[PDB]
Amino acid sequence: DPELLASVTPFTVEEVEALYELFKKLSSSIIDDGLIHKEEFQLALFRNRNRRNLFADRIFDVFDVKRNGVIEFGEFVRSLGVFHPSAPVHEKVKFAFKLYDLRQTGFIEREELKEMVVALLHESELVLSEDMIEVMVDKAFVQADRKNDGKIDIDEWKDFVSLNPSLIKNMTLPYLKDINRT
Amino acid sequence: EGPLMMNAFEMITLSQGLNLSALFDRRQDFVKRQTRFVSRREPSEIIANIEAVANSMGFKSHTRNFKTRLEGLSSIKAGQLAVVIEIYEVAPSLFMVDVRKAAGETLEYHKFYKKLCSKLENIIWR
Ligand SMILES: [Ca+2]
Ligand SMILES: [Ca+2]
Question: Which intervals of the chain are annotated as region PPI (chain B)?
Fold first, then answer.
């Protein structure tokens, strides 16, 4: 299984086994069941098991490939493989796209961008007017929406990111190479 | 010349929800405070004000391009805080000031940020 996992991901056997040590920590913090549930995930990211956040919900949801409400070790390793420095960049691009498509519409809707921008402000404890938020949403959206049709599609997103590669900066954990030593 | 442009998609990458570095922490005893604010004042003026307050608080400051590096001059280790501050234009008259800890103790950092903001309450926007 560590050998099977290592063969479907950029990780080696020794790396998968190192990640298992981490998973054991993350998955045992509230209910020790070899699974990570929403509250255990909020605890690992925020050090507050009760802190709700749109982006963490989106990450959690994408990690949960089995759509069963939890992250098993297999789900955990397969998804983290995408954050490896050596994962193909197009996988990184499509993972971010999936995160931002809040309600699985197949596009990044304009109101989905807006909801994200509001959540970011809320998260940061910043207070801005509706008009100001609109200017911010509009500038980004008109630029990504190449074809001028009112939605953002995968190919438009791919081109947008090719023009600003730092948009997927979060999509690399540049020390998934140094996990053995950790 | 001005601060780097940060469009809405760039801004959202700031979220603690999207950055999974925290899962790899070994020791974390404390909860992250939000250390960011927005302002409408001219960027060069934001910088000068941040430099002035920091100097009076016992920090050595070095600015390159709307990015400032602050180092504590205290002779006592807990006070040897390192901090980086960058300004980004998020909208034509709206600038975000993002404050980050480069080194030092979290609780000392939080104390610092609180004190900084109380000295700068004028430049901070609603
Ligand atoms: Ca669990
Ligand atoms: Ca489009």
Answer: 32-61
